[PDB]
Structure formats: C-alpha cells, structure tokens
Amino acid sequence: QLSEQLAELEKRSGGRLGVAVLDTATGRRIAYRGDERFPMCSTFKALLAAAVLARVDQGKERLDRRITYGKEDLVDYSPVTEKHVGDGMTVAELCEAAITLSDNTAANLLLEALGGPAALTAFLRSIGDEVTRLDRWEPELNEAAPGDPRDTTTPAAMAATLRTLLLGDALSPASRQQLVDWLVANKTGDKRLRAGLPADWRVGDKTGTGGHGTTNDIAVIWPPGRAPIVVTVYLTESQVDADARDAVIAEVGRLVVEAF
C-alpha cells in the first residue's frame, strides 16, 4: 500500500521520485525506485562526516584538530566557514557546519583531509556499499544532470549505508551518537520530512538540493515507543517549484506516519 501511494505521489511531483524505508524493528524494507540512481547533492555530507569519525575511531584524526584556510578556499554557501577565515575551525566544528547548515566549504575542507572524493568512495566500498559514488567537489557535484552517474546513490543503498553507520557497529558508540546529534540538530530541513511528522517523533536528517529540480532528504526517525526507521527520499527532474518539491517530501513523511 505504501508503495502504491508513493506512485501516486510521484505523479503529483512532476518528476522522478525514489524512496526507501528500512524498519529496524522488523527488518522490513519498502522501496519505490529503490535501485535507480539519483544525485545525492548535499545528502553525501552525512557520509562524509561518518568517514571522518571512522578515522577518529582509528586514532588517525582528532576532533579538536584545527584546520586553517583562506578566502580563496571559500565556495558559495558557506554560512559558518566564511566567519572563520581568520581563526580556522576544528574538525568537529567543520562536521557540525557541514551537516547542520550544509556549509559547502566545510565539506571541501573535510574532503581534502580525507584524500578527496575517491577516498570517500573507497570508504563506502570498504563498508559494503557498492553503489554510492562521489566524483566531484563542491559546488559542481550538485549539477544533477539526468543520466549522469557521477555523485549518485540509490535510495536503497543509501538507506542500508545509513543503517550501518548510524545504527550498526561500523562506528564507535561515541562517533555514532555524535553523528546522530548533528543530524537531529539540522537547521535546513524544517519544510521537508520534518514538516510531515508529529512533534514528538525524534528525527535527524540531512537535506540536498541541486539542479534539474532536485530536492532530497535522508533521515533516521524514532517514533515514540519504538525502534527507529531509516527513510531516504530523492526527487529529481521535477517541474514543480521549489516549495512544491519540499511539500512532496513532507507528504512522504505523512505517509510514513500513517504506515507505522
């Protein structure tokens, strides 16, 4: 039934909609275009922060290490990093900026510390994700051209990878909890999945927005009294306006509430 409702929603969206719902209470998975590729845009930043924390767990990085940079490093939409060209920022501060405000420069600085898009992709392969790929830096990775496999995931692969990192044991308990805290404190997602959920549901999410009418949101959700549910939502090639695309993702949130 959720599957059939998602197909009707896709018609309303004017584009191509991909959704995966992974219920950790039961291991049940629901998907719509779950194995098709979609542009990640800034949803990749959640994976990026995870890869940095994996290095912290191994003793190869420190949360309090300070990274310095200049005006020449700034790309557009850098609300936090632009305020600190003078003093630099710690690794923790960059993770938080990248997740909670989608700071683009913070993402590039963290990517450079990792070894670049190829290093992030290699980390994903090492944890069993054979599908997701990062190829470019900010801001070009948000092009979101139809038929281009660069910088894409599938809704099912992204949901499995999030489950492993956020809820499994690939990260240490301190790293998992810190990453979840950053997602819960996200400031950019109020009009998307969150708009479709009751106030008492705990939700951590990361949005993405890009070219060709692309609007995404990935989330881990704890309904009251329950084990959590991972939801990934990718919408692209959409011909309705940006506010209507947000409303589409909020309606996916409402469908999930009805279903669980």
DSSP codes joined into one string, 147-171: T--TTEE-HHHHHHHHIIIIISSSS
Peptide bond into 117 cis (omega under 30): no
Give the angle subtended at the CA of 55 by the CAs of 232 and 138, to the nearest 5°: 55
Rounded Cα–Cα distance for residues 46 and 49 (Å): 5
Provide CB contacts within 8 A for 206, sequence distance 6+: 42, 43, 45, 46, 99, 102, 183, 186, 189, 217, 218, 219
Strand, helix or coil at 115? coil
Q: Do residues 98 and 107 make contact, with C-beta atoms less than 8 angstroms apart? A: yes
Structure tokens at 82: 């632009």
Rounded to 5 degrees, φ, ψ at 190 are -60, -30
Residue 250 neighbours by CB under 8 Å, 6+ apart: 191, 192, 193, 194, 195, 196
Give buried/exposed letters for 74-84 (b at 16+ CB in 10 A, else e): ebebbebbeeb
* 102 assigned to active site: no
Dist. CA 94–CA 103, nearest whole Å: 8
Alpha helix (H) residue ranges in the chain: 2-13, 44-57, 91-100, 104-114, 117-126, 155-162, 173-184, 242-259
| CA distance linking residue 144 with residue 42, whole number of Å | 11
Active-site choice (3, 13, 42, 172):
42
Domain carrying residue 143: 1-260
Name the DSSP letter for residue 35. T
Give the phi and the psi of residue 198 in degrees, each rounded to 5: -60, 155
Domain total of the chain:
1
What's the CATH number where 96 sits?
3.40.710.10
Nearest to 75 by CA among 141, 19, 15, 31: 141
